[PDB]
A and B are shown apart, each in its own frame.
With several copies, the nearest count.
Chain A
């Protein structure tokens, strides 16, 4: 579970993301596609080329959802219900892939928020992404 400390950390680091969330979302996807090519099996229908608008479009969607979970940090299961349903029932992404994206999101943030990406913040952001992933996978079986 996320502690008050964690919550503060997350709201703060995410606070700094601001308006770049969209671009950071797109970037985390590309990093993921390049480092863990097996994740590409879920986007057979996408143009995964560099600067793909589909990827841009998708990065924004992911970022909006994360931004929504930060806004509702005390009621994530409910704030993310719909997305939890979609993933469990339609997309059916294998659970192991959540950890891969999480990882790429952490790399992206680290690469953009050097002053904020402290050990303490890093730890909080990692527990956070793990919790989002848990929610999104909760209705799988």
Chain B
């Protein structure tokens, strides 16, 4: 996590404009659609058979919001991601058994989601700041795996 002050201001300014409810649902839904293997964790979510069935599934939307919820909190402690994410890291490992590669796929999808939403505002340099951030978060979420 080598965020220059200017990189950090940039992450923060844009994050100001995000509707976490919305972005959360889109990012999670899109993950389940682009990398269908990730659907292995959600067999209790119901019908994920098509893009519409996934994108519109009330359970996917509610889970996405939860996920991005935790992520946003992460963005207020950019200094201590490991600390911030420690109980979650343990849970994902020990209870959920989620392969950490999942955290990197989601980060990439999120970046595409932000690009989708902000258009031209998501400049090369802003993308580069966010790239560092999703990686820092994925690393923090994997820190307690054993």
Which A positions have Cβ atoms within 8 angstroms of B? 27, 30-31, 33-39, 41-42, 44, 88, 91-97, 103, 106-108, 110-112, 114, 117-120, 122-123, 126, 140-141
Contacts and interface: CB of A to CB of B under 8 A. Distances in A.
A119 B54 contact: yes
A6 B33 CA distance: 13
Contacts, number: 98
Interface of B: 29-30, 33-40, 51, 54-55, 93, 97-102, 105, 108, 111-113, 115-120, 122, 124-125, 127-128, 131, 142, 145-146
Given A96-B101, A123-B34, A141-B36, A38 B145 contact: yes
Contacts of A110: 112-113, 115-116
B37 A126 contact: no
20 contacts: A39-B99, A41-B97, A41-B99, A42-B97, A92-B36, A92-B38, A92-B40, A94-B37, A94-B99, A94-B105, A103-B108, A103-B111, A106-B112, A110-B112, A110-B116, A114-B117, A114-B119, A119-B34, A140-B37, A141-B34
